[PDB]
Design a binder for this molecule. Structure first.
Ligand SMILES: [Mg+2]
Ligand SMILES: [Mg+2]
Ligand SMILES: [Mg+2]
Ligand SMILES: [Mg+2]
Ligand SMILES: [Mg+2]
Ligand SMILES: [Mg+2]
Ligand code: NA
Ligand code: NA
Ligand code: NA
Ligand code: NA
Ligand code: NA
Ligand code: NA
Ligand code: NA
Ligand code: NA
Lengths: 1011, 1011
């Protein structure tokens, strides 16, 4: 039948979808959510055999184990076990586009399990098997007999095995196909894997059972009263003695309960549902659920007989909350939300797409610790435990249907085709049927990047009809179609319009007020965090805070989809597209996370934490105004620590308890701050501390901070005249300057400081020269390739202009003796094919104190692409252990990504001044630095800098971080100016104009001396 | 696989749906809609074999003809050939309700055909087979190889046979299943049949072909300009030299043309449709389409090469019209419609559900001739020729999806189930894909009686998305749900509310103004024409005309679903539910038409024609005001004939040409009418005549009429005193009255006139006695049964009260002699178990002229159900050929159904005074009669009457008209009063209060004499 090549057949003998079941036969266990003897896990060691196609599978496999098979753990993706290669492709389908057909050579995974089934399970009731996730399609056999078929890799497929099981030994045979017609709806930008990657289990239900139940909570105007409504459905034989009791619990206290026989209200001319009943419980002053305070109740659903005999019980956590859009605003419990979200794929560097509780908990803790309050299930229903955790820890969730047809041309070719409506409807409807009782789910999503088709409108309406408690959104076809309650664009910029034909991405501020538009706007994806990114992040948040209808968005994305591979010595390294022989592929594009695959944070995470803070501050005189952005909670676990320091030197500090009502303000009067004697800039730093630990954070957790420049005293005191005076020796090839054991050498041919001596020790390995380029960031490269150049990409414009090829041409080099110092003057012209790109004019002034003052003045041709940087660089001979500096830090920060950085005195080990981005590029910069110390060296001024054992050249010639090798000495890049990194997206220039080096003329000065 | 027991599989290898194709290879042929050499018909003689189940079919059948098979005509329903019984069931499913399963004993029809195929059809292109209708599911094999499967009995299933055919002879094998999961969605109230009941054909298309095309027409505010937009889609190899040309023709005049290469506009990020193109043609002053004037243009779609070489051409008729709902009104070309519709099932008394052109044309002509302008396809897509005819003859059509699950409990059990969405969507989407280019289709319907489920909302939105040119309606779940643009109730009454729980049927006038309601209201079904019905029809039309938002409705229904059977002697008769051994069944309920199965009109049709007239009249003095209800046409084929008559005697007449603009008025001044000498009532009668013949009517066709009472001269002249005097001979047992050769005999024991003589010739066969009952009409019976009594039905209330058992008890009987006459006085009491139901007091006065004046005064107990009638009856010995009367006629008319009847002198053969309703009951009544003549008899007064060879008793004891037998003499029923017949529905009392005999006391007088 080749059911895997027919969108008309998405399953065979599959049971109806429903909320999580456990079939407890004890009410107390259901109330407390303890394990159930009726729900058994079949996870563990299974037998596995790989085949090139289903036609290659031997019939004997259905009867008994294949001796060639191996024993492997399940759940798992067989690519992670090495049976075949995982494929990383973004848009382009991994298979030829010829729906509904797939390749004849279709990798087939044959799984099998011999397990015991107790007689008692077969004597009565129904025994079903549940596959929470099988990628992408599969046939099931039990004890040699065919049971069924199923599609949709991200939702559970259940089958009744009651008639196939025998007391004792039983054997399951599961033939999993890598490709199927279902694959046409699973073109998400991620690794393409397959296998039984989610839990497998057995559930025993009585013949007369609870087959489904829906929980809803409605409120009065002030939420002081609520009505919990529970619709319960049954299957089996109806008897008048049957009953349903729904009890609601607050901890161990029962707050309400309702009991009734089956038989719903009349719905039409033929009557009502005899096999259904709806219980309604009144709740006074319910404790409301939110990501701020995840208050939860326990709802226990008991199916029993009138005389009190329990048949079975099911249950779920209940969160009393209302989600609604009113007057253009998305409200939660009557208050306008501000979504601090992030998109999160289910990815593990070692296990592939198999999820586990520990990894899920780790992600949630890091998310809340970094001020996120929402997550989008990009782009498919998640592992069931995820929603349970989000309910309890408190995170707003966008549950998304597993539908993405990005590679189609046009994108809506299938979604607008009525023949594909059946396949699509199952992916939407079964998701809703499964997750509708989770309070954390506040919005439904029709899928991702599948254009806009009539199928979307039909399914949008279906959800509005079955579940009016949640808004429905969908970005396809322009982000504001008739299939979405929320304007949810991806990568729309703050102020800049991108007028693409048919599907323009308007500035978000402009989008809101388009003629006739009234909906709220929340980006489903924004701030592409690929590599050294997140430049301009603060621009989004300033807009979110100023515009009521701009209610946030979800960053793209949480974690890099890099995979682990090993070298000959067994050392693991991070791999991406193409590293498994997979081709075609989209290389680095699978890595766009705020954290590395092992959950180690990228520098950008801190920028997100800061901009997403829940407390805002303003300074006026001695008064600090604290404003709360919390909607429901008071600041009852917050303390404000303040500190004043003069150039890193603390002068005063203290702490004040925070008592701010949600949306409220608090005024904190700072004590009389003493005036510092020494000259310099006084800085005020405040930070909110959480004294007590929480379920998601440790005691002392810092949730927010802010800095302000206070009084400044300009230094007007002249340095004590050094009785000493430098000496200038002159040869026809050099200009030397000595002062004690110190010597400065200037090559009169190149015009650069080629060497410095402190005794008999050389200080430089490479001359001090100007630098106007940087090892290209992912944002500088975009989608440009060696065989497919994107002339519009920054890196391509720099290359074409000759910025990387430019040769320094000496125009002038002179030296002069002053009453107390030696003056060296140089002038260079960087050209490319007769074109003068830059002109650098410098003056070096060495005085009796051994301090070298370097003054640089650069001219940039107005018609050459703006340079990535304007600074100097050299390879120092020294290799010290620490790097001490007075400037923005402690983490890596760039011009358009430095709001989170604080000004102070920082000291770190050299290795921390390098950011291990899987794909190497310019990195580790620190801006607004007034003083830098390394080894015996000290540089003073106002510059940006990065320092490491890797040259810009090696960084731009290496594709993977594990291939980098520490060079001799230490490479130092000191810039007077540095271009922004951008990030609004990573496939087109995204560096805002104000962060481009377009002034035409630049000036900066440095002072080099021995610390 | 048992695909017929899986709603997940509704087809296998079926081609996509699309508008009618013919694949012309000559553009002129396509323009003229002449037959296409590429579209062949396979209709004719096929081989057929019946089996009790699919498992009983021999494998050899796939290879060669079964010698036991018979040769039968196709299309056809095998029940009509006698292979098994057709089943008539209304709501209750004909099979056990256990979705998706059907009976194991599943009648299976094995059809096969050996046919030839020109080799040229196989040398190039694609050859497909098309089954326009197969009831209910089927598998297809070609030359022994399995081709595909298909469901949905009312839409075409197409399969590509290119790879299965050979030159010369080929053999098709079609296994048709009577029951399938599809049957759960086909529970319409009609005969349940099966087989290949619609055309079968072969279509040849080129490899590069037109695969679909959509035509739309948009207009400016005053419809003086239009833009015809044609989207054309292709399949096959794309080449830049391919072109599509769309030409629009008005007769033999090409009004517009457009040519372009393939390649649509950009729709999303992935581009646009390279395999599509949209042509836009401007049309100035387009001739608009409407049911009033069906103006049509011809659109020819040519797929060709740049060098002008034609590849293929398709085409369709185009009607320029706009359908939209604005401010609560349904508008057609900017004007509010008034729907004069009727529901029409595809039914033929001999061929079952097989439709043919002649029958379709006959129905359309009769419909338009009786002032109908709209038809509803109850309850499934019709034979494709139907829409073509409606486009050309001019009728508004409601195209309805083949979805009805009436027998489910509750009614929406399947429609609210997401697992049934796939099956449902195919029935809606494939209908739209097939009929969207027909101008006659102005509204889409989601189906019928399937409650209201989320599936309905999803499909409602799908249509609004793919075709915004037509409103969508659906009655299920309350008639005003979120799945309907029109409030479309069935059997909602005019003034009376029917507050059923959940799905009330409010008075239509009240429905319109319910809080928040703004939609237009058009009944999808009203005025149940079952048997002697349509009482109260005028009440609906008075409301439709007074309320702008009450825009009409569709009568239920067009033709009786009676079937022909032959007795032993091979004589045909009309049969209904149960007559084929089918059980359970719903008997007479399959007959609700305005016309008999053979299209002979029921009396009610004329009432509909009259109330649905397009011209309204008012009389003021000598002025007749004519108002036109036409929206677009002028009365350019209308003449007004007027006539004045005194008691049937014409005095003056004439004709005036009608010149009325749509919605306009015309004043016609009647000449000075001469005053009649004789006493009596002058009557004015006007009628609109169509001098010229049309496509739907003959010259002289009468489209409307109206009557008014003019001056009346009461007779004050006393009759010439007769020179004779009757004699009274009194005996113990009798009261005799003699006059010449005439004798009157009053039985003193019974108190009734038992005999009258004229010589030796007896006048009566049965005494003249009071009558207060009638042979129950279908509306009197409702759903009451012998084994399932409905105590609320009129017939049951009459029976329970003893109205049919009541015995006359003589209270007084006297004789008197007057100066010029003899006076007989009687008094009777009709009782039942000690209860006096009625009291009848009479006086008979016989004078010298031989005239007998009868005065009757009846008392009706206020606590007994109101009587069906109050009159006298007797069996006359005479049997004359003609019946002459001065009263309402000429056709049967009742108190609540007599507006169409005219007052005049009528003369008909006795047989026409009897209405052959298949189910016998009271019939043939004529109201407002002042004089009745039959044989030598003449009755004068003001009464209602019926006269025939069938007694009320025989009529109420006979189930079928063919079992009736003319009794001796003639039965005469003369009523002073008669109860209304009702009809708002036929399952609950529907006779309006004003037509119930509830006065308590009645009086009427008659005069019996010789003509
Ligand atoms: Mg499939
Ligand atoms: Mg994508
Ligand atoms: Mg700051
Ligand atoms: Mg089926
Ligand atoms: Mg029905
Ligand atoms: Mg009249
Ligand atoms: Na906002
Ligand atoms: Na990506
Ligand atoms: Na606090
Ligand atoms: Na690099
Ligand atoms: Na009206
Ligand atoms: Na009926
Ligand atoms: Na005329
Ligand atoms: Na009868």
């Amino acid at each position: 039948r080749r059911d895997w090549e027919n969108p008309g057949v998405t399953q065979l003998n599959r049971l109806a979808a429903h909320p999580p079941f456990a079939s407890w036969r004890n009410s107390e266990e259901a109330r407390t959510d303890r394990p159930s003897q009726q729900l058994r896990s079949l996870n563990g060691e299974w037998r596995f055999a790989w085949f090139p196609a289903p036609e290659a599978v031997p019939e004997s496999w259905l009867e008994c184990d294949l001796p060639e098979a191996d024993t492997v753990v399940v759940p798992s993706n067989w690519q992670m076990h090495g049976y075949d290669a995982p494929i990383y492709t973004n848009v382009t389908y991994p298979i030829t586009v010829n729906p509904p057909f797939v390749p004849t050579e279709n990798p087939t995974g044959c799984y099998s399990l011999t397990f015991n089934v107790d007689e008692s399970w077969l004597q009565e009731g129904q025994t079903r098997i549940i596959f929470d996730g099988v990628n992408s399609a599969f046939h099931l056999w039990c004890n040699g007999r065919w049971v069924g078929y199923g599609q949709d890799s991200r939702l559970p497929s259940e089958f009744d095995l009651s008639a196939f099981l025998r007391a004792g030994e039983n054997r399951l045979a599961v033939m999993v196909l890598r490709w199927s017609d279902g694959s046409y709806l699973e073109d998400q930008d991620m690794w393409r894997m397959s296998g039984i990657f989610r839990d497998v289990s057995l559930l025993h239900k009585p013949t007369t059972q609870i087959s489904d139940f829906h929980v809803a909570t409605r409120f009065n105007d002030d939420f002081s009263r609520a009505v919990l409504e529970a619709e319960v459905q049954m299957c089996g034989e109806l008897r008048d003695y049957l009953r349903v009791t729904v009890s609601l619990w607050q901890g161990e206290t029962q707050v309400a309960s309702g009991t009734a026989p089956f038989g719903g209200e009349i719905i039409d001319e033929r009557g009502g549902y005899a096999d259904r009943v709806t219980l309604r419980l009144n709740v006074e002053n319910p404790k409301l659920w939110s990501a701020e305070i995840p208050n939860l109740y326990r709802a226990v659903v008991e199916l029993h007989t009138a005389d009190g005999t329990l048949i079975e019980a099911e249950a779920c956590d209940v969160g009393f909350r209302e989600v609604r859009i009113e007057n253009g605003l998305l409200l939660l419990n009557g208050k306008p939300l501000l979504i601090r979200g992030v998109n999160r794929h289910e990815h593990h560097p070692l296990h592939g797409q198999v999820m586990d509780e520990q990894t899920m908990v780790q992600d949630i803790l890091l998310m809340k610790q970094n001020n996120f309050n929402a997550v989008r299930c990009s782009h498919y229903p998640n592992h069931p435990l995820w929603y349970t955790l989000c309910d309890r820890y408190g995170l707003y969730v966008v549950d998304e249907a597993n539908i993405e047809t990005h590679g189609m041309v046009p994108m809506n070719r299938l979604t607008d085709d009525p023949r594909w409506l059946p396949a699509m409807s199952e992916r939407v409807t079964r998701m809703v049927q499964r997750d509708r009782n989770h309070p954390s789910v506040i919005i439904w999503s029709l899928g991702n990047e599948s254009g806009h088709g009539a199928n979307h409108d039909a399914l949008y309406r279906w959800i509005k009809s079955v579940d009016p408690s949640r808004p429905v959104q969908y970005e396809g076809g322009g982000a504001d179609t008739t299939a979405t309650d929320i304007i949810c664009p991806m990568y729309a910029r703050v102020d800049e319009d991108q007028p693409f034909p048919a599907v323009p991405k308007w500035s978000i501020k402009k989008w809101l007020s388009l003629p006739g538009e009234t909906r709220p706007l929340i980006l489903c994806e924004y701030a592409h965090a690929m590599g050294n990114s997140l430049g301009g992040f603060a621009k989004y948040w300033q807009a979110f805070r100023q515009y009521p209808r701009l209610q946030g968005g979800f960053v793209w994305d949480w974690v890099d989809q890099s995979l682990i591979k090993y070298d000959e010595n067994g050392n693991p390294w991070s791999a991406y597209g193409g590293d498994f022989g997979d081709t075609p592929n989209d290389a680095q594009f699978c890595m766009n996370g705020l954290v590395f695959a092992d959950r180690t944070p990228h520098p950008a995470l801190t920028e997100a934490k800061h901009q997403q803070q829940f407390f805002q501050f303003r300074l006026s005189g001695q008064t600090i105004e604290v404003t709360s952005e919390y909607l429901f909670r008071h600041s009852d676990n917050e303390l404000l620590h303040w500190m004043v320091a003069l150039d890193g030197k603390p002068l005063a500090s203290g702490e004040v308890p925070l008592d701010v009502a949600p949306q409220g303000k608090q005024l904190i009067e700072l004590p009389e701050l003493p005036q510092p004697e020494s000259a310099g800039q006084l800085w005020l730093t405040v930070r909110v501390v959480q004294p007590n630990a929480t379920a998601w954070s440790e005691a002392g957790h810092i949730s927010a901070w802010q800095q302000w420049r206070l009084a400044e005293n300009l230094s007007v005191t002249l340095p004590a005249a050094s009785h000493a005076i430098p000496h200038l020796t002159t040869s026809e090839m050099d200009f030397c300057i000595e002062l004690g054991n110190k010597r400065w050498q200037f090559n009169r041919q190149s015009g650069f400081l080629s060497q410095m001596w402190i005794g008999d020790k050389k200080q430089l390995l490479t001359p001090l020269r100007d630098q106007f380029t940087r090892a290209p960031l992912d944002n500088d490269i975009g989608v440009s390739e060696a065989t497919r150049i994107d002339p519009n990409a920054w890196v391509e414009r720099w290359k074409a202009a000759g910025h990387y090829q430019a040769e320094a041409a000496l125009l002038q080099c002179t030296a002069d003796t002053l009453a107390d110092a030696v003056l060296i003057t140089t002038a260079h012209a960087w050209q490319h094919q007769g074109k003068t790109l830059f002109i650098s004019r410098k003056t070096y002034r060495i005085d009796g104190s051994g301090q070298m003052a370097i003054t640089v003045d650069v001219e940039v041709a107005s018609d050459t692409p703006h340079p990535a940087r304007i600074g100097l660089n050299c390879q120092l001979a020294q290799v010290a252990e620490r790097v001490n500096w007075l400037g923005l830090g402690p983490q890596e920060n760039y011009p358009d990504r430095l709001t989170a950085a604080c000004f102070d005195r920082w000291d770190l080990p050299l290795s921390d001044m390098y950011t291990p981005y899987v794909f190497p590029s310019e990195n580790g910069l620190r801006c607004g630095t007034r003083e830098l110390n390394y080894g015996p060296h000290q540089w003073r001024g106002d510059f940006q800098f990065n320092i490491s054992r890797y040259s810009q050249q090696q960084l731009m010639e290496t594709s993977h971080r594990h291939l980098l090798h520490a060079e001799e000495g230490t490479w130092l890049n000191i810039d007077g100016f540095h271009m922004g990194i951008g990030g609004d997206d990573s496939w087109s220039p995204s560096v805002s104009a104000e962060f481009q080096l377009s002034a035409g003329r630049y000036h900066y000065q440095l002072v080099w001396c021995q610390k």
